Symmetry: D2
Subunit: 491 residues, 4 copies
């Protein structure tokens, strides 16, 4: 594959029209150090306008007003266009993020599935009828789109996270104002192209690109946005919350990442489990809200199992993201690169044993990190508690099932969890007693958009995808009708 | 003839199944009789750190959440049955601390019994999803589980009834509770703690920590070990709870806040039926109600006549002693709210709106009473048009077309409740669909049991209470994916 | 618009292969009297072969072990090939049935809608988990396809009823043996071609064409069919029930027709109502099971209303179905035509008062009948009680809402009913208290496949369409797991 | 304890007790002493009862009330059931022969059924479609079907009655009950309870008598809208014919089974053995859901077979009034003979008896001993046919797929059991064995929260849970258009 001759100039998208931009962020491949894109830096005026378009499009019934059939037509068309242009979107995703082309193309197939699921849930979205309240009273509960929804996506899965929110938000008849990561805006603008091509009315999907402190905060505080999906860090989630209270009490769907445990029992398929732990921390080079960063292993196989994980971690093919054979790609931002390398550092200083990795992968160009494992970890240590968002794995030992669930639940977070055992009783106890919203039993990062996803504790608020994720962006209306004459209260 | 107690009743607070005495005490006097009635314990943040501890042990020990929905349903159904037995007591204390008429107060208790039976029913029906349709290899599952320790903060306007519209739905899932009633209406909450204990609630599953919002309330909104908070009250304190949550442990919030609820009357409605419903809407609980009908929106052809029919109803309402079963509206619960409502009437006059009725106190020598009030010639900018007054003050708006009615009905930062009054299916259905309010009444007002959810759009808050939706608000959805057979390795 | 020069010779479809006929039913256009098709008359051996194909396809995992993603992918591509080939299915539907081409094309749009809905339901199909049963006991309710489903369709909506059943049945992973009506077999075989083109595995969808006395009855008694969808007459529905009892206790989806009421209040839009009444009884020339055959109008406006309906019925364009302006077309079978003319005869003979129509429309070629309205009908009269399946309207008068409901309920059936009132309390009273499974308030025959459909009383069993319809062809399994060691019953 | 004279009952129509003009004289199957006098009613008594249920449905005296009111009557009934638990246990043993310990454990599940039902009455809901356009609104209503017939068998007279009646009642339906002729008492005691709890007249009618007079009158009745029937596939088939031949009444059928219990070595073979013993011995094998086909892994089969033999040879048989008695009498001489006939045929077909095989001459009554046959071929009579006695047949297997084929080698699909600690095997069996009531490392567990019912020839529809309450509701689709309509003719 060739890298671009010249960087690709992009516009931003508002009320159906693409605009040129007056200031531009030049993004380079973090894998190649060569310019690839020019994304417009939008203003608060650019954002107020996007929100104004989204409101017009909602109120004038051009989208919420249609039969669900017509919202489903657009999402099915989009899903179809997505498949047609998969190789395009994978190409651009890799260029801005650094992920392997194989991983990228896998994610595009999941997006297609997301759109098709949303198209289905557009028609299935329902409330209740209560015909059982008596001859006088009729109850019913309606669902309706909340209105103008702002979506803020991070740079880990720019296109897949975008596609795990946008189609579910639209299916109910909501309008969208999206602000992608500045470093990964291109695949989000390509979705704009696709949705326009698939016949999405003007104003319904608007992309305002730029920084979180200009456009992001202008959205988190905006007085006319009804609800915000934000996916990212617990810190910036907490900013969104303050902004909500301080503005218009807008609803918040928060997906905020975590310190996710993977519990391994001696009576598991140790080989398969070791493969899953390696994938679970190396996948997207460990730049993952749902990565399995804490290993919780039965002591009887702890030392063995750790070294099985090393065996898998050192076999991982690191290289050019464009090589179909490459398994893990580049660290997306220099900021995240220094954080990760600084955490491994501290870990070695806090008193932990480096069993493997701990260093960069020298390619001359780009930023790469070795899959890393740490043992002899105290729950005090920084690498035991803090989300590192790199391919660094801490190991912890347990004697009894109660101990494993306690070490797994010793977090402020609660996004994902994993349990590896052949014992139905152990699998169900850990599954039912570890406070996490996304669980895998003898599997890793499976599940389509059929099912919801989200976090316990500090890993956020609400659930995305499935019929539950369509529903999050609808408002519940209770309606009581009295039939016949009413007994007057007064005299 | 009802008699007030000879000496104020000194209560305790309830932590880990044990009842506590109190060190410092708040002295409450009837809002309607101006007579000492209760002595509630002023609690501490340490008393609260301990209540949350009682509830964490109760949730972590499996004494309620490891029990079966049937053993939790048994307690709730027992609780409903103890409420039927004690209806008269709860009525008495609620009246003493609130000012409500006794008749209303007894009505509210029957809704509270319905609520507990709904919670007992939901406890068994609480369910997630199976996905047997994902392939030979993959099996999908969505669990629900109790979120854990729930902080509950109730207001003073429906002290016992709003408590019974939260506590039992929270308890059904296997959540543990820590409750703060309002300090002016703390007694009937501690009576509920009595009922739940006699009904066989395990220790620690229900704690009641009485005191102020500035001390205990805040300590709860920022508590590091409370998993969810249910707040009912004002949008302003709701924003406080949101901030508190972000600065503490990113706890979930059930917020049920204020309203400026419209009631749309069309000319083709039953004017006399609608007039009665409007006066009730705004006068019930002396307009001290988040779901009150505080904005009349009436069709020009019948607007002035209807305004005058509503004032004739308003002025026929029997005001007096809340213990007289003939009394229809009661006292204003707090001096603050009294002063706020008289200030708003004052503003209403100042800003150019015309009083048609009311606009001052009702003198009984003892108590704080306000006369039902209607303003007309109200412009949408006016304070009385926009601000929640939380008294019996109604602002009337005139409209020509259905589109205008709905424009005015939506013309608020809020969206808790709404009413539409028409016999035309097309209008009722239009206004029901296009007005952004989470609780709607077609040719009725404040009807519907706990079968259905309730809650707000916009600034009237987050989440829904009651029905199955209510039980589920305090649960966490857990996705489970199981792979059966040998896995295809990622790494050769 | 050209008629076929020679009749088009089909084969049947078994285990993904087209099979030639040995013997053939020759069908001529019910409206042109020109040969149009030659369809294979199959045997019980051909039926047995198709069932064994459908059985091997369900137990091999070629469709039912597949993921809901894969099934949805075939159903969505099918819907896509259906819109692509819309005009070709219409052409052949019209040639065999008599439908106006305009109505034909509209029925195709609904078929597409049906396919998209089933595709969405393929993924949404779910059971229930019970986490609340205690720390010892975990409960769980699974749905799974029932297995080999027999589908038997009538000639009135050959393709539309097919598409309102087949895709819903397929969505769960059930396999099909289809037997359409011999007079209208062509569009069912064109769906077999379509399904195959869209990537449906072999054995999932077989069509065995032939008579009810041979293949139909062979299906109703088949010892390896798990469930049977029959649409048609109460009489054959009852046959099917007897067969299931004498066979393998297969579940039955029965859609068996009715004498449906349309309730017209004076406070209604009488103009809109009159149009609706004309449509309800004239649409598909009254050969609809959801046909408004019983007008129940308020006495205060009955005479005025009756005249309006008559004004509507005479303005109805009857003629060659391929003229895009014809609004009603030919009677499908000479049997039904004799039944309709006999019922109009009987009607007149029993003292009923003919207001309009009441005889054939002579075009020299074809079989056509006039929109026909009787007044002065007593509930004892034959036209009042018996299903005519022609464009014949009986008018009843009422004075009270009670009398309207009492009349509307005065039948053994309960498939459809309509109410026409601007009064919310009257429309609600009639809706809640009239025993009909398919209701229309100030409309007639609205509603895509989002919602279930089916009958009360003697109009049949079970529901079709919506997520409820997909679930009708699944079996509910309850699973209880106890975790830990158990309390022995024997010490 | 000893009954001095038979207790002569009445039947219950339109809230009144009517007197029997002819009677069935039941004797305790365990004591051979006259215990009860059940009125044998006429087909005009049945028509009279259906007319009452119909009246009570149509006058909105029950269906018309708020769910809150239906729930009250049901919760009150649950109350009176707990406070009368002993009375009903007494009469339940007297007519059935079941151990008093087991009888009381049932009344506890019956109370569970009543409370669930009361919850379901309030939570019963359909759907709103607000997603169809500015002009189109869509809505799905559920309503009580109307007058339901309920026929109960004699194995669990009161528990199966309570596993149908409260769920049928919760939606707004009225009922016409015919308990089993040998076991009508506890059903008549339920009628007394529902009345005292404030259930209107006509909502719950009991017409006692024969299946040939009253039952068949019901399955054919032109004004019964639906029939729950629990029992045999053949009387189910008779009900199907009768429905077709009459008015097309819907049918909630819960029929019989040959339910396999699969035991792997990966299991707690000791916890399984106790469960297999139970599975087959509970109610002296007089269960539609009894584990009657042991499916065990060859490698541990002979060991396990023995471990179960030991468990069966230890079960305490005797006076059902002894609270230490673990299995009781055979309810009918008809069944007793069928069971011995089947043990007899089993020896004859070349199957090996490891234990049981004959009656238990406990002084009086009909008591049969827990019986285990091994070296059973699928062709054998005892392999295929439902025995409804404590007779277990043992099969051996090497593979999981092998195990699943034997379990699915039946015309039935009511119950199944899997005993394994391997999640993969438990999950495969559960997913691939066509049975509607599943138990993984447990047996006959499950409360009213979960629906129950059969695959294949074990019946139609589901009972219990919210799904079970909904089976007796009818789905109405409502589409409303708003504003002026595009006219079809100019
Ligand atoms: N009782 C009612 O509801 C009445 C119904 N009608 C309407 O008249 C129309 C014509 O009915 P009619 O032609 O008599 O029959 P049906 O429409 O009921 O038969 C429909 C289908 O069943 C097949 N079939 C025939 N015999 C059997 C059998 N023994 N077992 C299973 N399937 C069988 C037919 O095959 P084949 O092609 O060989 O016929 C056909 O494909 C129906 O659409 C019905 O709605 C009108 C009067 C009364």
């Amino acid at each position: 594959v060739s890298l671009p001759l010249k960087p690709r100039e992009f516009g931003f998208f508002i009320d159906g029209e693409w605009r040129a931009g007056k200031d531009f962020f030049d993004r380079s491949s973090p894998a190649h150090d060569v310019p690839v894109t020019r994304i417009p830096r939008c203003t608060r005026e650019d954002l107020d306008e996007a929100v104004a378009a989204a409101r017009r499009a909602f109120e004038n019934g051009s989208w919420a007003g249609l039969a669900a059939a017509d919202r489903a037509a657009v999402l099915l068309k989009a899903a179809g266009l997505l498949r047609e242009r998969r190789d395009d979107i994978a190409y651009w995703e890799v260029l801005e993020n650094g992920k392997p082309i194989s991983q990228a193309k896998g994610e595009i197939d999941h997006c297609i599935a997301c759109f098709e699921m949303a198209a289905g849930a557009a028609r299935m979205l329902h409330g209740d009828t209560f015909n059982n309240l008596g001859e006088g009273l009729f109850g019913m509960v309606l669902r309706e789109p909340i209105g103008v929804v702002g979506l803020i996506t991070p740079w880990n899965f720019p296109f897949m996270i975008l596609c795990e929110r946008a189609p579910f938000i639209l299916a109910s008849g909501c309008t969208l104002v999206v602000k992608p990561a500045e470093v990964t805006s291109a695949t989000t603008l390509l979705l704009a192209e696709i949705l326009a091509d698939a016949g999405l009315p003007k104003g319904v999907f608007n992309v305002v690109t730029g920084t979180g402190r200009t456009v992001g905060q202008a959205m988190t505080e905006h007085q006319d946005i009804d609800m915000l999906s934000f996916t990212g860090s617990t810190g910036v989630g907490k900013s969104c919350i303050h902004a909500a209270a301080d503005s218009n009490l807008k609803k918040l769907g928060l997906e905020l990442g975590g310190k996710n445990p993977i519990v391994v029992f001696a009576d598991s398929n140790l080989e398969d489990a070791a493969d899953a732990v390696a994938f679970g921390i190396s996948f997207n080079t460990g730049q993952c809200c749902v990565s399995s960063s804490r290993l919780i292993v039965e002591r009887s196989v702890a030392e063995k199992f750790e070294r099985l994980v090393v065996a898998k971690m050192e076999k991982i093919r690191v290289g050019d993201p464009f090589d179909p054979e490459t398994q893990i790609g580049a660290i997306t931002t220099e900021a995240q690169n220094k954080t990760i390398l600084d955490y491994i550092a501290k870990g070695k200083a806090e008193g932990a044993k480096l069993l493997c990795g701990g260093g960069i992968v020298d390619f001359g160009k780009g930023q790469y990190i070795q899959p890393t494992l740490f043992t002899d970890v105290k729950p005090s240590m920084g690498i035991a508690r803090d989300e590192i968002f790199g391919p660094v794995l801490a190991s912890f030992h347990f004697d009894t099932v109660d101990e494993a669930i306690a070490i797994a639940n010793d977090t402020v977070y609660g996004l994902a969890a994993s349990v590896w055992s052949k014992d139905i009783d152990k699998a169900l106890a850990v599954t039912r007693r570890v406070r996490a919203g996304r669980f895998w039993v003898n599997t890793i990062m499976s599940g389509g958009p059929e099912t919801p996803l989200g976090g316990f504790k500090q890993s956020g608020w609400g659930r995305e995808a499935g019929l539950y994720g369509v529903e999050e962006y609808t408002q519940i209306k209770s309606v009581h009708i009295e039939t016949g004459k009413r007994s007057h209260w007064i005299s």
